[PDB]
């Protein structure tokens, strides 16, 4: 039916209108104070007033930190940009890691622009170029102008073109009898397809046949666009989208990450501010999530202390599972959660507590009904006892081998014997480690 | 074809109740691991869940990769099976996370439904209109069958495919409209005046009868990585073969995920997940493990199968020793299959099957002595001795391997243990760890 | 280890004429029906009847009377080996290299 992967039984924080966390709501069991703190953080992000606010989710393994991150993402909605990231992703062989971090920082910022578009469209009726006086003169083109006649519903318009537009028109491979669509903002032409006013069944080029477009040939339409600031920076650093030669050859070169300068980002900020001041654009700040932040070294942390102090920085959520560990890139500095103390002073730490037997049992209950499986009560008690004895995750994954072993005996219900058979067939970390210690040749 | 290490394994050897036979499909013994692998096989065949980590652990020469090829052979066609080693991730143009992302996306198959039209008949007239420089091409094709006749219109790709493998007004061609393929089936007109610049001896086929144009539904499976590489830049289809896919941006991947879900919503496509098999998984850095721990939690995640032959040893990138060479976070979200050593009857059955695969006839006493030396030494040595003993017996001009042939093969070619023994009495002849060697014999 | 059979025509060009059709089409010049090309080699001479579409490859490779050419069977697709050695000293200063006239018959099938 549908596919599930270690999540998707979580639909939100499950708070009230007063911010009080109910015990079993939103797919969440327990973690009440952490859910309330994350709800206050969600309201702070919705307030749209602060920049560079950082929190850290600190706890042990299998305690609900990534679940809280996706819960915050689902509470904020699809409008707010959310950028998930693992700490190993910053090490690029193309560009330095500082630029990758700043690229993600700009990617966690949204922008909603209402843009107007000038559109010429219709079915091509005539296509007649006029020649130049001296074609082999070295300077100048072979043609001077091209006359294109477009017709539509209640309209017929005759267009005189420069050579630069007609190069794009012929790059789209138009013909007489074609419905085209010309963008006046960038000179782009889209060839929609053949018109249905002629015969259809006499082609061999798998084409699609469109009716005559409605309205006048010349139009002005309003389009709502959703971009990020990284898109503006990338589109300006490697220019495409013009009909000039440098943008024309920028599409053919192999793309590569470059070090975007501060001057380009300042100019992009100036253009976005001028858009906002005219009542056209709207700024939607978002969240950057860095899971496994202990994989960062001291240089990325030291750049984080400078990148957090900008006046455009997003809200960055960090996660760790470290006790009193040495920071990577150092030899003697030992810090809580693997994060240096110059950054910890700028964070707000949120604790995340372990579970009890009843919480483990009901987590197995929701994971069973989301995976579309039916479990007996005694098998559920045995699974909860395994989850306390070995791990919650091991009891969570053993559900689907139990379902396969139940289906292979022409049955639907999961019984205790299936759980014992899945105990025997599949092992956990502790049993495998005990086999490893008592072994002949490094098993 | 040629004979490889696992050429004798075609399947997993299981019943309808997922119970292993003692000898089936080239696999002997290892009952519990084969039953667990059959459970993983049914888990893949259901296609319901995503991102499960399976670890296969045991001593060397036990049947780890044998189990992996059994799963791959029982998986069937059109389901992806990506097999990588631990050392292929380290690249000079790709980061480790990018290489692992591409290895994850190679294991998810997208099966696309496509409506095509087929045209077969006799060519009556070809008119081709070209420009003076030869760039713009257009024309008409006049094709006929017994009952029908239709003048078509051609474009540049059709004239390019018509000029290649030249058709000459009386040949019978078959046109695929969606794949754009022109296939010449033969010639039926038998034209009298042939200006023979060529040595064509084309087949005499009949003129086809019936409908000229016929619809057909086709299916083809493509991978998620291939769609990403095609959509990344202008010439990405070349980069599917040259490997010039340098760090595909994340925006391409989000748009491809949304479009694949959209194609599922119209019934045009469907998602067929597969198995990614990472052999020698201890040869991965700690950053790769930290990436895998969160890459297993995505909607588009395959079933990851890992094989390890190592004990409590040092994790790469760190300074501590962990079980199986893997950190405890990765071991938390994995289910472990344990594989055990062999008896002597299993070794004998393995050697008999490997002799039958190489088409080499063995005597009884040769089989017992090969079994004894595969018990005392390793099994792979006694499997390697079979072809050498066959060539020795073929030197004497008889097609059966005796005890003398395998005895000569044991004398000529050495084991590991005899090599350690011979090196340790003659340490002066070989170069030591400190660079000292005596080369003079006196 | 790949084996293949090549059927090939080569030799000095004796004549190179595009033959006009019986009924020409309007709006065009030089409506060709076949191209007559005569080949000459050692102990051999043979005149061929070719497709009209070999004439554009004749113009492409810049083939005149006196050059030695290389015609393979199925593709057409002539290519100029060079000029014959019998025309080596018509001019004091020139570049076109001069290769000898080929041996054997003009028609040969080699493995």
């Amino acid at each position: 039916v549908t596919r599930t992967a270690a999540h998707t039984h979580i639909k939100g924080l499950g708070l009230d209108e007063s911010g009080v966390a109910k015990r079993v709501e939103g797919g969440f069991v327990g973690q009440i104070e952490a859910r309330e703190a994350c709800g206050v953080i969600v309201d702070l992000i919705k307030a749209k007033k602060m920049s560079g606010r950082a929190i850290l989710l600190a706890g042990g393994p299998s305690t609900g930190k990534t679940a809280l991150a996706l819960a915050i993402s689902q509470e904020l909605g699809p409008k707010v940009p959310f950028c998930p990231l693992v700490g190993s992703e910053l090490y690029s062989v193309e560009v330095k890691k500082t630029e990758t971090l700043m690229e993600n920082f700009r990617r966690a910022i949204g922008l909603r622009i209402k843009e107007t578009k000038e559109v010429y469209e219709g079915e091509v009726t005539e296509l007649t170029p006029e020649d130049a006086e001296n074609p082999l003169g070295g300077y100048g083109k072979t043609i001077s102008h091209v006359i294109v006649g477009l017709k539509s519903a209640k309209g017929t318009k005759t267009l005189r073109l420069d050579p630069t537009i007609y190069e794009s028109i012929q790059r789209e491979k138009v013909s007489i009898g074609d419905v085209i669509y010309i963008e006046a903002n960038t000179g782009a032409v889209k060839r929609v397809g053949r018109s249905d006013a002629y015969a259809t069944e006499f082609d061999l080029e798998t084409e699609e046949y469109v009716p005559l477009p409605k309205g006048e040939v010349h139009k002005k339409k309003e389009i709502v666009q959703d971009v990020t600031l990284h898109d503006l920076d990338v589109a300006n650093a490697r220019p495409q989208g013009g009909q000039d030669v440098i943008s024309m050859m920028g599409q053919l070169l192999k793309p590569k990450k470059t070090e975007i300068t501060e001057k380009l980002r300042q100019e992009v900020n100036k253009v976005v501010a001028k858009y906002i001041d005219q009542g056209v654009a709207e700024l939607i700040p978002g969240v950057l999530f860095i899971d496994e932040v202990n994989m960062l070294d001291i240089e990325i942390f030291t750049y984080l202390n400078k990148a957090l102090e900008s006046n455009i920085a997003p809200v960055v959520v960090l996660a760790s599972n470290r006790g009193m560990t040495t920071v990577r890139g150092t030899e003697d500095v030992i810090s809580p959660h693997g994060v240096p103390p110059d950054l910890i002073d700028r964070l707000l730490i949120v604790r995340t507590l372990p579970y009890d037997k009843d919480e483990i049992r009901t987590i197995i209950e929701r994971r069973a009904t989301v995976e579309r499986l039916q479990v007996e009560s005694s098998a559920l008690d045995l699974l909860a006892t395994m989850g306390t004895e070995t791990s919650l995750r091991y009891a969570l994954q053993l559900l689907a081998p139990c379902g396969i072993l139940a289906q292979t005996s022409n049955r639907k219900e999961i019984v205790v014997n299936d759980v014992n058979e899945a105990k025997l067939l599949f092992l956990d970390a502790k049993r495998s480690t005990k086999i490893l210690e008592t072994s002949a040749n490094y098993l | 074809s040629l004979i490889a290490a696992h050429s004798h394994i075609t399947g997993l050897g299981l019943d309808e109740n997922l119970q292993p036979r003692p000898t089936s499909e080239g696999m002997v013994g290892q009952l519990q691991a084969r039953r667990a692998a059959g459970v993983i096989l049914k888990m893949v065949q259901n296609g319901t869940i995503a991102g499960r980590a399976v670890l296969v652990a045991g001593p060397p020469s036990t049947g780890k990769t044998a189990l992996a090829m059994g799963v791959s052979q029982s998986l069937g066609k059109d389901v992806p099976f990506t097999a990588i080693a631990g050392s292929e991730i380290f690249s000079l143009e790709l980061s480790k996370t990018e290489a692992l992302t591409q290895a994850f996306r190679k294991s998810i198959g997208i099966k696309i439904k496509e409506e095509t039209e087929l045209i077969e008949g006799e060519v009556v007239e070809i008119q081709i209109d070209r420009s003076i420089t030869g760039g713009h091409k257009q024309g008409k094709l006049t094709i006929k069958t017994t009952d029908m006749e239709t003048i078509y219109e051609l474009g540049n790709k059709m004239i390019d495919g018509l000029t290649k493998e030249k058709v000459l007004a009386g040949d019978v061609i078959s046109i695929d409209k969606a794949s754009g393929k022109i296939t010449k089936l033969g010639r039926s007109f038998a034209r009298s005046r042939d200006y023979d610049a060529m040595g064509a001896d084309t087949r005499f086929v009949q003129c086809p009868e019936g409908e000229l144009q016929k619809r057909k539904t086709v299916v083809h499976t493509v991978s998620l990585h291939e769609i990403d590489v095609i959509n990344s830049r202008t010439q990405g289809f070349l980069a599917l073969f040259t490997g010039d896919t340098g760090e595909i941006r994340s925006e391409v991947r989000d748009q491809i995920n949304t479009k694949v879900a959209e194609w599922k919503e119209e019934g045009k496509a469907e998602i067929v997940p597969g198995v990614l098999f990472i052999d020698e998984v201890h040869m991965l850095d700690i950053e790769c493990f930290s990436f895998i721990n969160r890459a297993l939690e995505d909607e588009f995640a395959p079933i990851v199968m890992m094989a390890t032959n190592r004990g409590v040893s040092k994790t790469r990138g760190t300074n501590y020793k962990s079980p199986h060479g893997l950190p405890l976070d990765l071991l938390d979200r994995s289910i472990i299959i344990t594989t055990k050593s062999y008896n002597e009857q299993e070794i004998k059955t393995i050697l008999s099957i490997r002799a039958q695969e190489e088409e080499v006839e063995l005597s009884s006493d040769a089989l017992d002595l090969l079994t004894k030396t595969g018990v005392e030494t390793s099994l792979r040595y006694s499997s390697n001795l079979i072809s050498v003993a066959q060539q020795i017996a073929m030197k004497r001009k008889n097609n059966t391997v005796e005890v003398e042939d395998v005895k000569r093969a044991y004398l000529l070619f050495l084991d590991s243990a005899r090599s350690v023994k011979y090196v340790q009495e003659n340490e002066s002849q070989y170069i030591d760890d400190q660079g000292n060697v005596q080369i003079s014999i006196a | 280890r790949i084996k293949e059979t090549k059927e090939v025509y080569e030799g000095e060009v004796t004549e190179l004429t595009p033959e006009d059709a019986e009924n020409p089409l309007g709006g065009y010049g030089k409506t060709i029906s076949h191209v007559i090309v005569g080949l000459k080699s050692a102990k051999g001479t043979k005149t061929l009847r070719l497709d009209p579409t070999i004439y554009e490859s004749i113009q492409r490779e810049k083939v005149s009377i006196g050059d030695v050419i290389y015609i393979e069977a199925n593709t057409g697709a002539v290519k100029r080996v060079g000029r014959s050695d019998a025309y080596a000293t018509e001019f004091d200063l020139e570049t076109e290299e001069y290769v000898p006239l080929p041996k054997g018959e003009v028609h040969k099938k080699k493995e």
């Binding site: 002629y198 | 008119q127 209109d129 070209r130 420009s131 008409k140 034209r191 | 409506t31 029906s33």
Partner: peptide, 28 residues
């Protein structure tokens, strides 16, 4: 009713005709 076929325009372009008995090639 039957829709008209798309107009065909080949002006200033060579032509290659291939029939049962004879092949032409009109050039400029």
């Amino acid at each position: 009713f039957v829709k008209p076929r798309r107009p065909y325009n080949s002006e200033g372009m060579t032509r290659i005709l291939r029939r049962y008995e004879e092949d032409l090639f009109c050039t400029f």
